Design a binder for this molecule. Structure first.
Ligand SMILES: Nc1nc2c(ncn2[C@@H]2O[C@H](COP(=O)(O)OP(=O)(O)OP(=O)(O)O)[C@@H](O)[C@H]2O)c(=O)[nH]1
Ligand SMILES: CN[C@@H]1CCc2c(ccc(O)c2O)[C@H]1O
Lengths: 223, 331, 284, 56
């Protein structure tokens, strides 16, 4: 009957180890990096630096980023992440099944998933310079592939009106899906990034802080 | 086209199956009396997991058990005294299955990483790392102490060899993802339930498909095997459990109700095979009757969805795992 | 008149006790409500239950029969318990406000700042500080007055009244009410500012496609507390500064207004949907 | 269809076509017999005394 004492000692040691690990588990924040192919996800993760894990710390806050296709069923495991980062090629509107239409369909499918009811999405609209060159060079029109561009007018804060309309139309097309069935549980944060940019990590930090603050405000019935 | 040319076969096999069914099992089973209301109360509760629990497997001694969580830890429990024995950290934080060796010396666990890992309990360090799958692992079972059969998310099942670390036999034929499998007591034939609403019977020795069943109409999430060895039950997302048969090669009964529209996550039998236990997404578990189709009880007490289920070899208790990071022992 | 007063006041007693016991049992029974924020609510509920089960009925008997039938020791014990419960029932609200401030303003360090070990320490410290100003000054006779009517009332064991000098009537009020007021005001002003900023950001980002709730919640939270406990802790100092200004009848009524505040607390601090579901699971 | 994989299916359906079947009455009777025979050796269905129950 002496084995009971040894078992209790082992249980105590394991409980102490788990108690130590709980704090470091609760301190970190998890982000899921989801993007369509040829969008530029590799460049973004390289700038930030069957699975890939990236470690980075901003202002003494530990973040943890993950990267990973048809009938996505593994997505149920990602209902407790802080936010979902979406990378989409804004200039690939005619590199045809338009590459963009597939991106909007994927975004709509992810938004309405049952297990992702309370997960926000951070949206990166990559490849702005290619889009600007394509719209300015001529022989390519947004109206040709997307008929709705004819009846669209500029809402706005410019950083060349044609490229401004081109930039804002794609953003509004995603924002409409975002606000169709938001219900106040989760929002979207559009952004206009490029390959040669700095402080993209600051955007992620600020958006995570905003998400956490909004959730806390909603919990106490103040928003 | 040419393919359409024998699409008829399927119709001929369906007609033969219809001609085979003389009468439903229900009619045959009508005279026997009902089991009645069965009340089960929880006996033990285990705490220590920091995240949701995905899978668990009872030990062969009906005393110990192992569980896996999203925090990246495997813990071996002791049911009688509810004290932890082991805690193994994991390289990958995403796990979807776990298994316990029949000889009680090895534990295996795989997940979203396309790797199956085996640990040595009595030496706790990594002993082998099996690779070769192009999709996430969904289930794995120890066929013996030297060879293991696994099912992956790339529509294939394989039989491995631990000593050499290379595949021995590869099973192909499904279209959708493979989600769960079970082994016969004789360890000669095993079944699998794919995501294409189809179940197949495989032969380990031959390596070729033998029979196919396509009763369901949605994704199949769990599958169990009747103790006698001549039947198996499965559960899908359409809130229906169906009991098939190997010899008759057709469905015999359906377990469904109009007051439930949620999915099914786990299915298990009892020692006698009279009781069928299935876990739902309705935050609780239901106990059916294998023959009559009546409901005989409910297992409530979990605050989040149930994702695991198991029955001991001697049938002294039944364990449930949920996303609430709690393990409960019922009796 | 006598008949009418008695029945209601029993209804007040029942209303105070029922909600407090219900909240305590609901928090204890279910493991999903064991939250660091719910410990302060448990302490507040316990203090309010002790107050409503200890001081209200004896004061009822006193105000009904107009004669204290017990000894001087029981009078001292009653007056001590009154101050203890009243003082401990407000600093807990201050603690809750500070916790909400930390949770909202500092979202990335909330988890580390507050832990299950720190909550117990804070609650014990608050209870000790509440008890130090209620039993030590009272069991010892340092609070007693000096004028002839006071000592005459002290001598008689059949009557019990409240007589204090300026020092205690100022110190107890400062400790119990005035200090935990400015902190709460500053906290809730900051919370309102943060809510307004977030709402403005949302309107700027997605206004075209798509401050009342926060104002309503802050209004109810501050208004009930200020209306319940404000006049008493002003007349408390006024009746000492000017003797003839305030009569005893006004004092007793303004004090009894405060006791009702314990009944409102479950409605104010337990409207969360999880609490509603837990309440509906039982007692039905 | 013209692709091999579709073509492979037609042959397989065949292999599964030529197997021996039995009447469902025999299978139902066998299942009933097994359940009735092994019905006295399970603790879930039959509540055993707490003395023999290790979880009490
Ligand atoms: N100048 C410039 N070039 C870019 C930009 N974004 C992408 N590119 C070009 O695109 C190439 C990078 O492609 P990747 O990011 O590897 O595409 P990917 O990562 O394979 O995309 P996935 O299929 O989603 O993984 C580079 O050679 C760049 O020249 C940009 O913002 N500016
Ligand atoms: C008899 N009722 C007492 C009188 C004075 C007093 C109360 C509460 C808190 C204080 O700090 C006090 O000075 C009241 O509950």
């Amino acid at each position: 009957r002496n084995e009971e004492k040894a078992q209790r000692e082992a249980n105590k040691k394991i409980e102490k180890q788990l108690q130590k690990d709980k704090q470091v588990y609760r301190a970190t924040h998890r982000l899921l990096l989801l993007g369509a192919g040829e969008s530029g996800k590799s460049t973004i993760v390289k700038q930030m630096r069957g699975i890939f894990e990236t470690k980075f710390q901003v202002d003494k806050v530990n973040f943890h980023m993950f990267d990973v296709d048809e009938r996505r069923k593994w997505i149920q495991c990602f209902n407790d992440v802080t936010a979902i980062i979406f990378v989409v090629a804004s200039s690939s509107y005619n590199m045809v099944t338009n590459r963009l239409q597939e991106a909007l369909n994927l975004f709509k499918s992810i938004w309405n998933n049952r297990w992702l009811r309370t997960i926000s999405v951070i949206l990166f609209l990559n490849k702005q310079d290619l889009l600007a060159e394509k719209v300015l060079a001529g022989k390519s029109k947004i109206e040709d592939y997307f008929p709705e561009f004819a009846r669209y007018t500029t809402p706005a804060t410019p950083e060349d009106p044609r490229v401004t309309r081109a930039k804002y139309f794609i953003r509004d097309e995603f924002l409409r899906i975002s606000t169709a069935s938001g219900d106040g549980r989760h929002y979207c944060y559009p952004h206009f990034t490029c390959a040669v940019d700095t402080e993209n990590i600051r955007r992620v930090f600020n958006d995570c802080r905003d998400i956490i603050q909004r959730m806390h405000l909603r919990q106490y019935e103040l928003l | 086209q040419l393919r359409q040319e024998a699409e008829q076969l399927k119709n001929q096999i369906r007609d033969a199956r219809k001609a085979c069914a003389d009468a439903t099992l229900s009619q045959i089973t009508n005279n026997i009396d009902p089991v009645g209301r069965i009340q089960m109360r929880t006996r033990r509760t285990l705490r220590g997991h920091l995240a949701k629990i995905y899978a668990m497997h009872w030990g062969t001694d009906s005393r110990l058990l192992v569980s896996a969580s999203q925090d990246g830890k495997l813990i071996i429990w002791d049911s009688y005294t509810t004290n932890k024995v082991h805690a193994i950290p994991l390289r990958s934080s995403w796990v979807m299955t776990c298994a316990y060796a029949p000889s009680g010396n090895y534990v295996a666990c795989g997940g979203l990483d396309n790797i199956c890992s085996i640990y040595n309990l009595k030496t706790v360090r990594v002993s082998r790392e099996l690779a070769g799958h192009t999709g996430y692992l969904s289930c794995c079972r120890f066929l013996d102490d030297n060879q293991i059969v696994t099912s992956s998310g790339d529509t294939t099942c394989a039989l491995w060899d631990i000593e050499t670390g290379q595949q021995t036999t590869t099973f192909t034929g499904h279209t959708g993802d493979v989600m769960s499998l079970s082994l016969a007591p004789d360890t000669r034939l095993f079944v699998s339930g794919a995501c294409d609403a189809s179940a197949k019977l495989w032969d380990v020795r031959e390596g070729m498909c033998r029979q196919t069943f396509t009763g369901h109409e949605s994704d199949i999430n769990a599958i169990c095997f009747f103790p006698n060895g001549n039947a198996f039950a499965t559960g899908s997302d359409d809130a229906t459990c169906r009991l098939f048969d190997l010899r008759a090669d057709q469905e015999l009964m359906t377990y469904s109700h109009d007051n439930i529209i949620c999915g099914i996550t786990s299915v298990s039998f009892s020692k006698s095979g009279r009781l069928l236990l299935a876990g739902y997404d309705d935050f609780n578990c239901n106990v059916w009757d294998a023959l009559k189709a009546d409901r005989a009880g409910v297992l409530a007490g979990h605050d989040n969805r149930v994702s695991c289920l198991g029955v001991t070899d001697d049938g002294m208790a039944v364990a449930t795992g949920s996303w609430d990071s709690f393990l409960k022992i019922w009796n | 008149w006598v008949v009418g007063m008695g029945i209601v006041m029993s209804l007040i007693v029942l209303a105070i006790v029922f909600g407090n016991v219900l909240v305590i049992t609901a928090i204890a029974k279910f493991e999903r409500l064991q939250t660091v924020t719910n410990y302060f609510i448990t302490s507040l509920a316990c203090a309010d239950l002790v107050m409503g089960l200890a001081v209200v009925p004896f004061g009822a008997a006193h105000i009904l029969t107009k004669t204290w039938t017990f000894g001087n020791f029981w009078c001292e014990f009653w007056t001590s318990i009154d101050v203890l419960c009243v003082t401990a029932s407000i600093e807990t609200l201050c603690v809750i406000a500070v916790d909400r401030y930390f949770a909202i303003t500092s979202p990335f360090k909330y988890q580390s700042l507050l832990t299950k070990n720190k909550a117990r320490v804070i609650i014990l410290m608050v209870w000790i500080v509440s008890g130090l100003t209620s039993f030590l000054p009272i069991q010892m006779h340092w609070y007693r007055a000096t004028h002839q009517e006071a000592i005459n009332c002290y001598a008689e064991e059949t009557c019990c009244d409240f007589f204090t000098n300026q020092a205690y009537a100022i110190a107890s009020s400062i400790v119990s009410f005035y200090v935990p007021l400015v902190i709460m005001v500053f906290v809730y002003s900051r919370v309102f500012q943060e809510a307004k900023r977030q709402l403005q950001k949302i309107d700027k980002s997605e206004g075209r496609f798509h401050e009342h709730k926060a104002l309503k919640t802050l209004g109810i939270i501050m208004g009930t507390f200020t209306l319940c406990w404000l006049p008493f802790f002003i007349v408390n100092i006024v009746h000492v500064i000017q003797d003839n200004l305030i009569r005893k009848e006004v004092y007793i009524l303004l004090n009894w207004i405060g006791y009702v505040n314990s009944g409102f607390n479950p409605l104010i601090y337990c409207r969360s949907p999880d609490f509603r579901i837990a309440f509906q699971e039982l007692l039905c | 269809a013209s692709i091999a994989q579709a073509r492979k299916l037609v042959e397989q359906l065949k292999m599964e076509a030529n197997i021996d079947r039995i009447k469902v009455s025999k299978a139902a009777a066998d299942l009933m017999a097994y359940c009735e025979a092994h019905a006295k050796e399970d603790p879930l269905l039959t509540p055993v005394p707490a003395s023999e129950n290790p979880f009490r």
